[PDB]
Structures are given as structure tokens and as C-alpha cells.
């Protein structure tokens, strides 16, 4: 957006002062929307010396004479041209500015407007900026952040030593990555994205997107009335082991609940019988194994089973020994169908196999699995969307990096999912998502589309759980999937 401001000014000819005025008045309108009538409140506006502080001066000036009290604390050492202009107007309109932050000043205000740093923050916040931000966070006042809560890196969502915790953040043009990834997402509080007059062409030129209800609605496949099961695709799920007998059941039903026509599981005998005892609409094929895990002896049978389906999901509950590794990699090298690759299939995956596949693939790792897959630490891969993009591009796949905010990327387009809650932090949740993705692929969606729709719906289903989210289990999540679809429509 740094470039979006610049082009809007330099190429389109919009005066910088117009953009800044529209930014500030958007903050005022957003506050009124959340607080109701502003006239009874006393506002403390904390302004830096940059253009964020300039926006702050616009806010402060526009409250003059309309609210109970306004005071600006100016915290910088110099002012950008637009910040100087708007500081000048604020004073001309009768506004009061002080240049020293006094801890007890918080006592006489109701709302703190945080206009210290925006997207121009570079490096750790220290010194008096940090003390001030810490005092605001202990104050219990209503906090409104201009653009991004000060102290959040707008490109990553990381906290730069300390950061403002906002009740309301008003940002301009588009959401920033730091509003979307944690910890930034948490500090942002309620986010409003204000149109401040950038041309819509520049706003739509962005390559990274938040997944919205309207996007998912447009991607849901059509259900022609004169259809039959084959119209809606066929999925094979290769899953399970003597150790992990439940995984296949959750994945299979995941495919059925999103509207797939036929789902077949291949599961080691007698663990295959667990599936049909719970959901008799599944086909659960018994696979004869030596010790309860897939091995190369099952290669030919799984390839045979794959011939009559549209997509294959592999991984959930397979186990991770050497015989599983041999099977997984030889199967994926030979399989000429789209594959959705999860869990233990990721843990044993030879990424050379992905490069050589002619057919597409979706991988669905959590950060632990992604760490192992690229031989990095969890902290280096977590919310690392640039790494995810590089991986997807190099390996010709779609990568779905699961976390509270899920990243979906094919290396050219990256989408962020923010639906869901902590009920999904529990075994079995990922197994469901794997089946949803395979099911949407079988229904005709591209691997990226299927992933986009599935992460959104899987999170939205969790949110529809009636009781406390901590009690949500994967079996309840399945029941909620058709409600999420209905509501989406």
C-alpha cells in the first residue's frame, strides 16, 4: 500500500492532503459506528511524527468542538510535510498539543486514539514509545488504532518488542498482512477497512486476499437437478492403520458432507470395519497388511482402486515407518490423479516426487509438518507466507499451511482464511478438512479453489457449534458442515 498511496498521488494526481483528510474522517465515522454519539467522550490522541500521526491530527481536529475534550500528545522529533500541515490546522482550529506524556493523563480521558506508528514502523520500539504503549495497555480505556496498532509489523503480524492492544483498528484501502496473521490479528481487535479514494484498479491489483463469504459463494459448485452420483465425483481415501483407526472415517465423511457422490476408503483390515459401523454410506475396502500398516505389497491394489475415482487423498492415520514411506512415495510417483496429501503422507514425503508428478497436488501441513518437510524450525515456517509461496511454486502444488489463520497458495495467488475457533485445535479436525478438499476437487473445483472453499467452510462450521467451542469434536464438526453451506448461500 506504500506504493498505492504513491501512485494515487503521483500518477493519478490526488493531493496527499486529500488522502490524509479522508483517512482521518474515516476514523471518526468508524468510532461513531462503534461508540454511538461521540459528544460525551474525552479523547486522547497519540501522534507520531509520520503520516500516521498526520492522520491522527486530522482525527483530533475533526473532534474539536463536537466532543467533551480532545488533547493531542505529540511524541515525535520532526514531522513529515502532511503531518506538519495537519498539526498546523489542529492548532489553528484551537486544538491543544503537549509534547510530554504524563502517566496520570490517562485518568482524564475515555478513548485513546493510537496514531503513533503505522506501516512505517521499522525495528523494535523502545524508550519512551514503549513506556507509553505499555501505560495505554494497562489503562483500561477504549483504544482505537489508526491504520495498524502501533508496534505491529504490518508485513508479518509480529510484535516489535511491544504493541498497542486495540479495541478498534481503522485501516485504509485494504487489510494489511499484520491485521490477518497473529499476534497482530489479536491486537487489531475489530477491523474496519476504509475507502479513502484510491482508484479501485489499484486496490484490485493486490495478489494476496482474505477469503470472504462472497468469494466462497461464487466458487461453490452448481447442483444440476438432472444429476447422478457420478456428476458429483468419486474420491478414494488411503488412510488408517492398526494404530489410527478413526482417521479414515473423519476424512471420508468430510468428502460426503460437502456433496461428493461416492467415497471409498482403503484401510487395513479389520480397521476398515470401524468406518461402516459409524457411517454405512461409506465404502470401506479391507486391505490385507502384514502388521497393520500399508506397505509396498499394497501398491498394486491401491493403484487399481484409484483408476475408477477422480481424486485420491492419502495420509491421515497411516503411521510413519519405513514401509509406509516406500509405499507413499512409489504410489504418488505412479498415481495419475490429483492427490490431496496430509499428515503421515507429508511426514514421509520425498518432495522430488512432487516435482516429477504430471497430476496436481494439494498439501495440508500444520507448521510442525511443514517444518519437517523443508527442514526448518516451526518458528521459521509459522505464518511464513513467502516460504509457502516459494514451496508451492517450486513443487507445482497448492500448499495449505494450517494455523488459526490458514494460508492457501499456489505460488501466484495467496489467500488467508480467518474463519474458525479453538475448537479446531483438537485431533481429528485436520482429517475432516482433507476429505473436504478432495471432495471439492472431485466435484470439479481446481485444487486452489477447492482448498479456498474448504478452509473457509471448515472454520465457519466450527463457529456454528452451539455450545462452548472447547467442547467441539470432529464428529460434531461433520454434522455442522451442511449448515455452513446453507448459511453461505
Amino acid at each position: 500500500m506504500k506504493e498505492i498511496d504513491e501512485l494515487t498521488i503521483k500518477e493519478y494526481g490526488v493531493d496527499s492532503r486529500i488522502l490524509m483528510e479522508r483517512a482521518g474522517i474515516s476514523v471518526v465515522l468508524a468510532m461513531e459506528e462503534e461508540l454511538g454519539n461521540l459528544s460525551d467522550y474525552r479523547f486522547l490522541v497519540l501522534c507520531g511524527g509520520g503520516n500516521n500521526g498526520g492522520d491522527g491530527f486530522v482525527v483530533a481536529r475533526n473532534l474539536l468542538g463536537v466532543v467533551k475534550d480532545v488533547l493531542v500528545v505529540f511524541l515525535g522529533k520532526k514531522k513529515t510535510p502532511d503531518c506538519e500541515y495537519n498539526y498546523g490546522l489542529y492548532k489553528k482550529f484551537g486544538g491543544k498539543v503537549v509534547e510530554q506524556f504524563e502517566p496520570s493523563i490517562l485518568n482524564e480521558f475515555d478513548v485513546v486514539v493510537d496514531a503513533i506508528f503505522g506501516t512505517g514502523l521499522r525495528g523494535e520500539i523502545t524508550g519512551e514509545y514503549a513506556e507509553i504503549i505499555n501505560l495505554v495497555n494497562k489503562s483500561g480505556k477504549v483504544v482505537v488504532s489508526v491504520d495498524v496498532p502501533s508496534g505491529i509489523d504490518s508485513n508479518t503480524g509480529k510484535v516489535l518488542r511491544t504493541a498497542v492492544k486495540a479495541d478498534l483498528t481503522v485501516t485504509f484501502g485494504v487489510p494489511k498482512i499484520g491485521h490477518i496473521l497473529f499476534p497482530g490479528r489479536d491486537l487489531t481487535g475489530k477491523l474496519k477497512v476504509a475507502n479513502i479514494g484510491h482508484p479501485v484498479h489499484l486496490i484490485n491489483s493486490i495478489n494476496r486476499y482474505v477469503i470472504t463469504r462472497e468469494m466462497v459463494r461464487s466458487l461453490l459448485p452448481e447442483r444440476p437437478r438432472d444429476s447422478h452420483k457420478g456428476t458429483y465425483g468419486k474420491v478414494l481415501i488411503i488412510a488408517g492403520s492398526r494404530l489410527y483407526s478413526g482417521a479414515p472415517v473423519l476424512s471420508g465423511m468430510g468428502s460426503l458432507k460437502v456433496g461428493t457422490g461416492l467415497v471409498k476408503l482403503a484401510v487395513p483390515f479389520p480397521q476398515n470395519l470401524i468406518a461402516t459401523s459409524r457411517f454405512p454410506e461409506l465404502i470401506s475396502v479391507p486391505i490385507d497388511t502384514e502388521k497393520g500398516f500399508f506397505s509396498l505389497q499394497n501398491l498394486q491394489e491401491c493403484l487399481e482402486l484409484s483408476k475408477d475415482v477422480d481424486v485420491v487423498a492419502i495420509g491421515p492415520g497411516l503411521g510413519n515407518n519405513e514401509h509406509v514411506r516406500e509405499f507413499v512415495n512409489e504410489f504418488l510417483k505412479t498415481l495419475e490423479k490429483p492427490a490431496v496429501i496430509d499428515a503421515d503422507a507429508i511426514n514421509v514425503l520425498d518432495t522430488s516426487v512432487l516435482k516429477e508428478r504430471k497430476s496436481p497436488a494439494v498439501l495440508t501441513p500444520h507448521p510442525g509438518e511443514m517444518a519437517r518437510l523443508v527442514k526448518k524450525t516451526v518458528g521459521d515456517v509459522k505464518y511464513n507466507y513467502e516460504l509457502a509461496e516459494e514451496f508451492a511454486k517450486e513443487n507445482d502444488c497448492v500448499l495449505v499451511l494450517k494455523s488459526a489463520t490458514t494460508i492457501v497458495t499456489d505460488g501466484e495467488k495467496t489467500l488467508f482464511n480467518i474463519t474458525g475457533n479453538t475448537g479446531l485445535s483438537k485431533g481429528g479436525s485436520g482429517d475432516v478438512l482433507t476429505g473436504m478438499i478432495a471432495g471439492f476437487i472431485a466435484q470439479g473445483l481446481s485444487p486452489l479453489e477447492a482448498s479456498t472453499v474448504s478452509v473457509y467452510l471448515h472454520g465457519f462450521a466450527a463457529e456454528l457449534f452451539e455450545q462452548d467451542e472447547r467442547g467441539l469434536t470432529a464428529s460434531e464438526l461433520l454434522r455442522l458442515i451442511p449448515e455452513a453451506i446453507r448459511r453461505l448461500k
Partner: peptide, 7 residues
């Protein structure tokens, strides 16, 4: 409903 704000 949405000229100024996306939610």
C-alpha cells in the same frame, strides 16, 4: 451499505 467500510 459498503461505500466507505469493508467489515
Amino acid at each position: 451499505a459498503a461505500w466507505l467500510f469493508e467489515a
